[PDB]
Design a protein around this ligand. Structure first.
Ligand SMILES: *[C@@H]1O[C@H](CO)[C@@H](O[C@@H]2O[C@H](CO)[C@@H](O[C@@H]3O[C@H](CO[C@H]4O[C@H](CO)[C@@H](O)[C@H](O)[C@@H]4O)[C@@H](O)[C@H](O[C@H]4O[C@H](CO)[C@@H](O)[C@H](O)[C@@H]4O)[C@@H]3O)[C@H](O)[C@H]2NC(C)=O)[C@H](O)[C@H]1NC(C)=O
Ligand SMILES: *[C@@H]1O[C@H](CO)[C@@H](O[C@@H]2O[C@H](CO)[C@@H](O[C@@H]3O[C@H](CO[C@H]4O[C@H](CO)[C@@H](O)[C@H](O)[C@@H]4O)[C@@H](O)[C@H](O[C@H]4O[C@H](CO)[C@@H](O)[C@H](O)[C@@H]4O)[C@@H]3O)[C@H](O)[C@H]2NC(C)=O)[C@H](O)[C@H]1NC(C)=O
Ligand SMILES: CCCCCCCC/C=C\CCCCCCCC(=O)O[C@@H](COC(=O)CCCCCCCCCCCCCCC)COP(=O)([O-])OCC[N+](C)(C)C
Ligand SMILES: CCCCCCCC/C=C\CCCCCCCC(=O)O[C@@H](COC(=O)CCCCCCCCCCCCCCC)COP(=O)([O-])OCC[N+](C)(C)C
Ligand SMILES: *[C@@H]1O[C@H](CO)[C@@H](O[C@@H]2O[C@H](CO)[C@@H](O)[C@H](O)[C@H]2NC(C)=O)[C@H](O)[C@H]1NC(C)=O
Ligand SMILES: [Cl-]
Ligand SMILES: [Cl-]
Lengths: 336, 333, 113, 336, 333, 333
């Protein structure tokens, strides 16, 4: 055990952690890979998502070569603060957490040829810009971009540890999504440019599709039921003026409440979503049923035959047109 | 004789290397764990997590810390924990955690003559628990705590529950307003990641939801509105405004109850048990309204048929609602 | 942009334009041999006035948002009150209330003897 | 000044702050008292309360004896980090704050005989389990328990500075309570045994009694007015079937809404409070009025005399029964 | 020369005991305070507090820091404040406070040749403020900040407002939508605790609440609903459904207004001014409904009396409502 | 040759006093700034603030850090920033800021051979923005970021935008849901407080609100309810229950729309544009209900006048509502 203490003391003797390995001689190459332990909730209102990862970096530092009875030193993570490490940050991160319970969730390993493995456990909140025209039948590609903060590409480059598609691995039971479905990920790398120079960026896109069931049993079904309820009025006799008026006013009030309540977990976008179009058409149907009653009541005591004809025609026209609209709408949006 | 104890303690930390685990380069160090659970706070379905407060004690042996001539176990100031090696234990499914720090950091270091260290912490942790809400509110959940070593693989360290099945205490005295703890379980296993194999301890609880709140809050109002919808069958068919008001009110109120209830839970895409009950109640009130509409449609030429239809509704609707309740509560209980 | 109009003993300062970005109006007077001297300041909305020592209990400042005016009423004059008067607007984060450098839009000079 | 610097340097020469005073020789006795500057809000949903205290501890350390021109050194609280102090914690604390603005709110005083006075300013959030069967006419005993974290009763014992009743002192104008009254407090001490040994625990119970006015004008009055409104229906003539139907329907809907909304403040306990019983009986009255109207309407055209008799008897029975119920309920729950 | 100043400051801090106050063992050290208010972010009735942001300036003399040969005042990097003695000033009624720390800790240290230290901080504090809401929303509040020394008694330390009445500036920068500042006051005193007597500065503001929002959103809806309830008097007494619908709607809407308004405030037990107004409006609408109930009760045998009752209600209800409003607005304004 | 670089960097920090600014005792040190706006997340009328993430770069010259013999920019580990002098820059109007710290502190230190220091931070800041809501939601706001030295006056330090108007980048890429950035402006000035004069940089944005959400959310429901109220004029005047139902429903819906509107804004005491529109609509629906009350009152004895009043109301209400809409939408656009 004294041998390893002497080895560590010699490794750190005269070491300067203010300097990257290969400073002034070569580029520092960092191999990176991410293990997602849970792909957490997506927040539509904040346009963001949370992800919990093991973030793994590996690189060569010739100043740390050693020779001893073991080939890999698995050290206490405090040693990480004594050596040089890459200064990786997430470009679209919002407020991340490096876990510190019960100790810093970090690991450092040194191989005798000077290779360093450096792993940490992180919870990252990241921006996912969403376009909600097709809501609630929308799909998104949520990104995760990371790279060096201070070192340009002439100093530090990043590479995926293995094939890029196999360097971002999602745990099989690691899904905290309630509203979305994760379809896969695409892995890529590139160069970003800024006033301080050119930097390497590593990018991962997660492909999410919104599940529709909640909005079916929360918004679409009540709208359909309100339209059917408004059309029930066509079968009450023309003497029942207060009853048909009650039908009309109650269905219009219900439609207004549903239209207002439809956007409650969404950002205040300036355009219309698909659900908004559905609600607008349902509102038009309900309002037109009330206008039909007003027209029927106007002609009741002067041209009773015309009123009877209008009622009979409406009894067929309204449901048929609503069914045709539903066919067109669902074919348009579920086949996109 | 504080001078001799001070000499001994200063001797222990003289050549101590905190960067190396005990038995570095040799067999794995064994770490026994025990937990005294103080409370389990909010079990949230919206956030899909639960909060736990506990005393977490770790027990191991470091021969570098053995001492002689002092027939006492040395409880030291907790800050001495910053100069000794401790295991890098973490919780895999924890979202936010902290060690209590009033009045000081709630930490205990107790040394023993043979080099045994007892290391205690008081921890509050919010831990993720994905819940299956298909049978909600008659559901039963299973929530876990996953205890693992971050950096040390199974060749450096090995965990075990110290005391067998009695390593976790205080479960039977927990009081939860909405749940009851049916059972708790302790598991020891290994998990393989790309960086090696690691020891894992699992502490799981099985929670059974209490239904009294939901009987008071959701089922009873729906039943009362469904019964209210049947009053129409006892009103004569010529009173159109009264019966239409009754039916429309029941239908809209049932829809309002369902939509109001569904917004206290996460936006899950599937149907829960209470959702099925409310949808059935909606079907009943809607069919009562349709019955009145049909009676109103044919009560001029055929008044006797309308009277008969009302008379049969008076019996059919309660009977079918009773059968629906029987099937529902036999299926879900 | 704020336009300040001076009229007027009583001096009136009528402001037009972006009075929301400059929520404070202040009064200053310049002596023939001395620098500009702070007299008082008024908030457009809060109506919370502040005065210099030399004109406490004598000068009064009032504000009306109906036509965006602030009035300085001068009473119990003295021969040491013969200075060219100015009205100015102060930004929301412009600093100290007593320093002419912090005021952006200055009105026309008004003479008093 | 240099005399005091030399005294302080001599006190700290060879002083080990890892060792409690009297280690291996006798028991460290800590005298404790609490000054409550504000007894903060009580939360029923979280079952917790907040309290702001000056927490005062006092003990004897022979290693800190001195002889100088002054008898008591009132030192900068930095000195407290260089000597031994007790590891006191609150057993039922949830998340507390040691105040740090503008400096750590701590004070250390050393008397020449080796006596230390150590005071800190704390905000403690503590657990208060509540039995809400009598809500909103209930009373609680919220505990505050503290003791040593790591030292057993053979090493550290806690005592109240003066008589236990006089050791916890609540400020006159330090009530941040909104819906509660602080009736008093009791003070006690005892022993608690856990897996690591036996520990001294000091307990203070604060007795709280809920004020009812908010719930009187928030729940009880709307329910009573709804019942009276429903009983108004008995005076309308029997021809006005739509009017009496509207009365019954709207009162039943109001009762349903009140019942659903009355449990917002409370946690979701699995039993019925007193308010729940009151609302259930009011609901029964409103439903029974609607059923009475249905019965009267059923017999109107076939047996008019029976319908008139039922209306006449109901006009007397319903107010009398509601008055008797109110008398019994309030007598039961007020002189509890 | 930078090296000469460097060695001057090194000499100042050589032999400096940070554990001792200036003139330790002698007369008390005097600390002068200035406050420059930047804003009051919010005033909360539910939490009974308010958030204040300010520049807090402390002035004192430490003879150990006197220097000669440089006729200049040394503005030092704020990190040097970690090496100097500073007063242990705290705020007694504060609940959560921080010093701003971007880009660096918002702290300032300025030394003067004779030993005077000027020490500045930028602080945001959420301070408690107990509000009396009996006259709400026509109420006037008094919110204070209590500045005290924690460890040093009046024998060690003295506090004073530096400049007297001009020690606090920036009051005109306070822009609250729901309040206006009427007055501020400075107080100096001593407070006796069981550990001794301590200096105490107090800064208080008087807040006047603006009535416009409540006129727009609470009083007018109630007035309009009360007026709408009078439309029943002009409708013929054969329209039982229409008049009953009018009365029921007005009554339930008044109750809804009251419940919705009261749910947004702390659960105080007493009655506020707005509550008394809403209850008066409820009494008026309930009496209109009762009037129709009586007219419907009597009109089939005494139609002339029912017509007279409606005719008199048309005049009486607006008159008594105007009297109620006159009395209410005279008493509360 | 890394050993020479190490020796040079050790030499630069030998005898270095971080308590002293560059050119201490001489002319002011000039600090240039530039900002890359990464995002502007949320703009809140309720809290009167906005959130912003940026790369903030400061540039200055420190001749103590000049080095020779190394023809390279020296990017150093960001912890070297703790061993150097940096400016004490802060944001006056900020409410809560932080530097990102994952995986390490998001900080950059780059030395140049002549002694030039580039110091970069990544900052998320919430900043106050007082908003004028008199024309809401047709309003336009001006939100600023104020950048100042905390301790150093203009005799010690000077600020300037590095590159003039090109010093702030990334504004044109910003996408906001409710707003669009019309313009951004850069200003440099001096500000005088009681403690002296300080340099100030201001960055201002002008935001114009998008109207579509409010067209879909509040204006169209109000228009549709107002139109719905006119259906009453086409129902025969003797159907009292129906027309009273229409009037009551329209009034209730107006109140509901208004409450949903007000549940999203701060409690300001003045009238907004949307408030003006909503109370115009309320006046219209109330007038329609009063028209029915009049017709029902006079139609028993004067059927012809009642028919004429209904017939004329069929035309007058749409015409006046169209005129009110024309005036409203011409006064605000
Ligand atoms: C009241 O008390 C709280 C804690 O309860 C204080 O907050 C802590 O303040 C200390 C002192 O400033 C912080 O400790 C120092 O942190 C430096 C780094 O700060 C950055 O990173 C941390 C996270 O790692 C962030 O929290 C922080 O905001 C910054 O972004 C370290 O560099 C310091 O270490 C240096 O000195 C030690 C001396 O031994 C050396 O060993 C180190 O190598 C290094 O040179 C130091 O650790 C602490 O992080 C703060 N914690 C929190 C949670 O904020 C308040 O400041 C205090 N308030 C008052 C008024 O006193
Ligand atoms: C949001 O709202 C803020 C105010 O709250 C607006 O900020 C103002 O912006 C204008 C520019 O549009 C600023 O005006 C300019 O100020 C410059 C700096 O002045 C300082 O230095 C001079 C001496 O050099 C002093 O006299 C002065 O007191 C200041 O200390 C001037 O240099 C500019 O002058 C230029 O224009 C004038 C004509 O206008 C010419 O005569 C000059 O030669 C020169 O070309 C100019 O005056 C103003 O200072 C800002 N106010 C504040 C408080 O910062 C934002 O513009 C607004 N945002 C948007 C997007 O509109
Ligand atoms: C109190 C109660 C009041 C309310 C009323 C109660 C009534 C009670 C009565 C009945 C209850 C019925 C409940 C059904 C719930 C189904 C949910 C489900 O499983 O959805 C499934 C999908 O769903 C689809 O794919 C269908 C979507 C199209 C629906 C079209 C409706 C047409 C109506 C025509 C009308 C014509 C009318 C003509 C005129 C008369 C699964 O959901 P998911 O997993 O989230 O989806 C995955 C999405 N992803 C793959 C893209 C990721
Ligand atoms: C728009 C509004 C719509 C609603 C309607 C508006 C109507 C407007 C008209 C009138 C409104 C009148 C409002 C008064 C409010 C008083 C509040 C108060 O302070 O109460 C105090 C008195 O409380 C008690 O003493 C508790 C017991 C109450 C019993 C009530 C019985 C009613 C029975 C009716 C039977 C009818 C039968 C009829 C049969 C035909 C509360 O005391 P406290 O101190 O806060 O609490 C105790 C605290 N302690 C435990 C620490 C001691
Ligand atoms: C130090 O701690 C050890 C471990 O708990 C103590 O050893 C136990 O002491 C109890 C005392 O009742 C015995 O019943 C056990 O049989 C002991 N176990 C072992 C393995 O020795 C020891 O007594 C403690 N020492 C002191 C001085 O308290
Ligand atoms: Cl999700
Ligand atoms: Cl309370």
């Amino acid at each position: 055990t004294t041998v390893f203490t002497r080895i560590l003391d010699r490794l750190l003797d005269g070491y300067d952690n203010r300097l990257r390995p290969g400073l002034g001689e070569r580029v520092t190459e960092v191999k990176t890979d991410i293990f997602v332990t849970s792909f957490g909730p997506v927040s539509d209102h904040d346009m963001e998502y949370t992800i919990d990862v093991f973030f793994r970096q590996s690189w060569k530092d010739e100043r740390l070569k050693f020779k001893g009875p073991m080939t890999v030193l698995r050290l206490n993570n405090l040693m990480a603060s004594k050596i040089w490490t890459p200064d990786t940050f997430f470009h679209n991160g919002k407020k991340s957490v490096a876990h510190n319970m019960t100790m810093p969730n970090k690991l450092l390993r040194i191989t005798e040829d000077g290779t360093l493995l450096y792993t940490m456990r992180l919870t990252v909140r990241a921006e996912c810009p969403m376009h909600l025209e097709d809501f609630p039948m929308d799909a998104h590609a949520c990104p995760l971009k990371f790279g060096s903060y201070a070192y340009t590409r002439a100093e530090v480059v990043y590479e995926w540890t293995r094939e890029p598609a196999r360097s971002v691995v999602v745990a099989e039971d690691g899904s905290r999504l309630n509203q979305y479905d994760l379809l896969g990920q695409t892995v890529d790398s590139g160069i970003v440019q800024s006033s301080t120079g050119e930097y390497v960026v590593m990018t991962t896109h997660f492909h999410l599709k919104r599940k529709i069931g909640y909005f079916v049993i929360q918004t679409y079904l009540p709208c359909i039921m309100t339209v059917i309820l408004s059309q029930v009025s066509f079968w009450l006799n023309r003497e029942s003026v207060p009853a048909r008026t009650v039908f009309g006013v109650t269905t219009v009030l219900t439609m207004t409440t549903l239209s207002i309540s439809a956007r409650n977990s969404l950002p205040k976008v300036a355009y219309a979503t698909a659900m908004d179009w559905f609600i607008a058409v349902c509102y038009a149907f309900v309002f037109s049923a009330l206008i039909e009653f007003a027209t029927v009541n106007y002609f009741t005591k002067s041209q009773p035959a015309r009123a009877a004809k209008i009622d009979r025609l409406s009894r067929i026209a309204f449901p048929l047109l609503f069914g045709i609209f539903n066919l067109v709408y669902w074919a348009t949006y579920l086949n996109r | 004789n504080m001078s001799f104890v001070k000499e001994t303690v200063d001797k222990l930390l003289k050549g101590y290397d905190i960067r190396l685990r005990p038995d570095f380069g040799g067999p794995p160090v064994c770490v026994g764990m025990n937990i005294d659970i103080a409370s389990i706070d909010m079990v949230s379905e919206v956030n899909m997590d639960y909060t736990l407060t506990m005393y977490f004690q770790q027990y191991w042996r470091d021969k570098r810390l053995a001492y002689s001539g002092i027939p006492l176990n040395l409880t030291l100031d907790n800050r001495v924990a910053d100069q000794l090696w401790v295991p890098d234990t973490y919780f895999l499914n924890d979202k936010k955690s902290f060690v209590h720090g009033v009045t000081v950091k709630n930490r205990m270091i107790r040394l023993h003559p043979d080099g045994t260290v007892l290391y205690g912490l008081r921890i509050t942790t919010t831990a993720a628990c994905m819940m299956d809400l298909r049978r909600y509110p008659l559901d039963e959940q299973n929530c876990t705590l996953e205890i693992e070593s971050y950096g040390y693989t199974t060749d450096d360290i090995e965990f075990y529950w110290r005391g067998g099945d009695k390593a976790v205490t205080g479960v039977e005295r927990i009081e939860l307003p909405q749940f009851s703890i049916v059972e708790h379980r302790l598991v020891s296993r290994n998990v393989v990641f790309a960086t090696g194999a690691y020891p894992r301890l699992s502490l799981s609880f099985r929670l059974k939801r209490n239904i009294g709140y939901f009987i008071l809050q959701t089922y009873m109002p729906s039943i009362l509105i469904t019964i209210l919808s049947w009053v129409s069958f006892w009103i004569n068919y010529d009173a159109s405004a009264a019966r239409v008001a009754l039916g429309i009110t029941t239908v809209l109120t049932m829809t309002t109850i369902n939509t109001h209830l569904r917004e206290t839970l996460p936006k899950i895409p599937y149907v829960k048990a209470i959702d099925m009950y409310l949808m059935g109640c909606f079907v009943f009130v809607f069919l009562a309204l349709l019955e009145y509409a049909f009676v109103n449609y044919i009560f001029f030429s055929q008044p006797a048929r309308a009277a008969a239809i009302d008379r049969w509704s008076r019996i059919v609707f309660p009977f079918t609602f009773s059968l629906f309740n029987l099937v529902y509560w036999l299926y879900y209980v | 942009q704020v336009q300040l109009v001076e009229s007027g003993l009583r001096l009136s300062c009528a402001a037009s334009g972006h009075t929301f970005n400059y929520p404070i109006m202040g009064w200053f007077r310049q002596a023939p041999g001395k620098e500009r001297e702070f007299v008082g300041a008024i908030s457009w909305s809060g109506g919370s006035t502040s005065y210099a020592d030399s004109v406490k209990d004598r000068f009064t400042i009032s504000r009306d948002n109906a036509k965006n005016t602030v009035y300085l009423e001068m009473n119990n004059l003295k021969p040491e009150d013969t200075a060219v008067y100015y009205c100015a607007a102060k930004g929301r984060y412009s600093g100290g209330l007593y320093y002419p450098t912090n005021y952006d839009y200055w009105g026309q000079g008004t003479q008093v003897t």
